[PDB]
């Protein structure tokens, strides 16, 4: 089947977008060595929050007022 004209234009535009993405990824701000350890502190704190949530699972408090509140269903006007 013949390749449509509009189809060729569409893919050519997509090729240009991806080709430019090569350019912007060719200029690393920091080298490999300079990266090591720069974000260690933030990562460690994030994991600690994850651990705290996992080990905080436990049942909930129970109150006499909640259970005694059921008696209010029979409230009336004198």
């Amino acid at each position: 089947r013949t390749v449509s004209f509009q189809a060729k234009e569409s893919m050519i535009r997509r090729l240009e977008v991806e080709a430019e993405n090569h350019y912007w990824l060719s200029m690393p701000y920091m080298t490999a060595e300079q990266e090591c350890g720069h974000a260690a502190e933030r990562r460690a704190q994030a994991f600690e929050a994850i651990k705290a949530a996992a080990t905080s699972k436990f049942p909930k408090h129970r109150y006499i007022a909640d259970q005694l509140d059921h008696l209010n269903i029979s409230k009336k006007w004198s």
């Binding site: 977008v17 991806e18 430019e20 993405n21 090569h22 350019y23 912007w24 990824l25 060719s26 200029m27 690393p28 701000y29 920091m30 080298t31 490999a32 990266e35």
Partner: protein, 112 residues
Amino acid sequence: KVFQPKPEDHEKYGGDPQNPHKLHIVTRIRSTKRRPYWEKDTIKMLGLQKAHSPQIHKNIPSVNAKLKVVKHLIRIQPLKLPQGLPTEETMSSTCLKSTGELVVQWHLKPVE
């Protein structure tokens, strides 16, 4: 070789080989559907779930490696700060242009 720039490439895109930009503006332009499972994961790792939603990422080698895997599914535009980085006072008045400039003052008035 693909990621080694050429002198003409710098002129076309107007980017200096020195003083490289720091932050990428990355948006998802195409679907993860019908893509290999590994490409699906990288998109979610980078946070590009909703298309046409810009996300700020570091221009560092580790991030670049992941960004290259999904090179075909996204558009990368260098972030620009004409008026400098936002401060605490101006943090609530920021606005990102389609051009890629994060202005720190948004008045909604004619420029004049």
